[PDB]
C-alpha cells in the first residue's frame, strides 16, 4: 500500500516520516472509502467485464483460438477467463492500496518467464490487458474510470 511505502522508504534512512510523507499518508487515508466504494462496483461487474474482454482479445487474435494456438480447446480457454479474473481481482487490490505493489509483487514481477514457459505469447497478454482496460470503460462512467485508468497501463508498462 501507500503507507507501507512511506514506512519502508523512511526506514532505510533511519528517521521518522517527514512533513511531506505524512501528507502522503493523510491524503491517502482521507480518500479511503472511495476506493472501497469503487472496488465493490468492479466486483459486481467481473462477470460483466471478462465476458467483454473475451470479445475483442480473440477477434483481434484468432491465432490463439484456432487449432494449433495455445488457447485452442475448451479447458485451455476455461482458465483463459480465469487469468482475467485474477488480473481484475488484482486491480481491485491496487485500486484500494493506492499504488502498484499488489500489481507488481504479484502478476508483473517475472510474468514474462511464466508465460514463456507456458507458451502464451507475451505480446498477446499485453493486448489482453489492453483489451481488459478497453472493456472496463463501458461498465464504468467517466468520473471513476480515469481513477482506474492509470492502474491498467502500469500493467502494460510492466509487461514490455
Amino acid at each position: 500500500s501507500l503507507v507501507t511505502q512511506v514506512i519502508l522508504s523512511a526506514d532505510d534512512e533511519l528517521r521518522y516520516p517527514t512533513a511531506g510523507e505524512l501528507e502522503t499518508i493523510s491524503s491517502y487515508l482521507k480518500t479511503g472509502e472511495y476506493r472501497i466504494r469503487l472496488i465493490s462496483i468492479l466486483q459486481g461487474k467481473e462477470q460483466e467485464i471478462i465476458r467483454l474482454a473475451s470479445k475483442k482479445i480473440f477477434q483481434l487474435h484468432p491465432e490463439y483460438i484456432a487449432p494449433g494456438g495455445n488457447a485452442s480447446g475448451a479447458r485451455q480457454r476455461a482458465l483463459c477467463l480465469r487469468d482475467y479474473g485474477w488480473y481484475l481481482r488484482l486491480i481491485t487490490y491496487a485500486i484500494l492500496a493506492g499504488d502498484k505493489e499488489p500489481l507488481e509483487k504479484i502478476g508483473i514481477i517475472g510474468v514474462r518467464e511464466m508465460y514463456n514457459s507456458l507458451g502464451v505469447p507475451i505480446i498477446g497478454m499485453i493486448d489482453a490487458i489492453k483489451c481488459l482496460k478497453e472493456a472496463t470503460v463501458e461498465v464504468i462512467s467517466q468520473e471513476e474510470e480515469d481513477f482506474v485508468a492509470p492502474y491498467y497501463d502500469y500493467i502494460i508498462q510492466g509487461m514490455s
Binding site: E46, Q47, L79, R82, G85, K105, I106
Partner: protein, 103 residues
C-alpha cells in the same frame, strides 16, 4: 447445583463433640472443624497484580513468524466468477514462508 436448602447455614456445626474432663459432665460443643481445604478454583474475585506485567506473546505460526501470515486460516468473503478447480491438490500447505503473498 445449590440444591442444599436441606442444609442451611448450620451445616458443619458438628454438635456431638464431647469432652468429659473426668467423671463429671460431658461438656457438649459445636465447634465447626474446618478441613485441610484450599478451594481449588482459578480467576478469583480481584486482580492481585501490581504491573510488573508484560507477559503476552502471540501463538506460533510455524515456520513463518507469528501473525505475520495466518492468511491460509482466515474467514474471508468472496471467491470470484470463473475460478478453475485444482485437480491435484498436493496437500494443504502450511504457513508460507518467511515470505507473505505481497512478496
Amino acid at each position: 447445583d445449590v440444591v442444599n436448602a436441606a442444609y442451611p447455614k448450620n451445616i458443619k456445626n458438628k454438635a456431638p463433640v464431647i469432652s468429659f474432663d473426668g467423671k463429671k459432665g460431658v461438656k457438649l460443643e459445636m465447634v465447626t472443624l474446618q478441613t485441610f481445604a484450599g478451594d481449588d478454583s482459578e480467576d478469583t474475585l480481584f486482580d492481585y497484580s501490581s504491573g510488573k506485567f508484560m507477559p503476552q506473546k502471540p501463538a506460533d505460526m510455524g515456520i513463518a513468524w507469528p501473525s505475520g501470515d495466518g492468511r491460509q486460516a482466515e474467514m474471508k468473503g468472496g471467491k470470484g466468477s470463473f475460478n478453475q478447480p485444482d485437480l491435484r491438490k498436493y496437500g494443504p500447505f502450511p504457513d508460507f514462508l518467511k515470505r507473505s503473498m505481497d512478496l
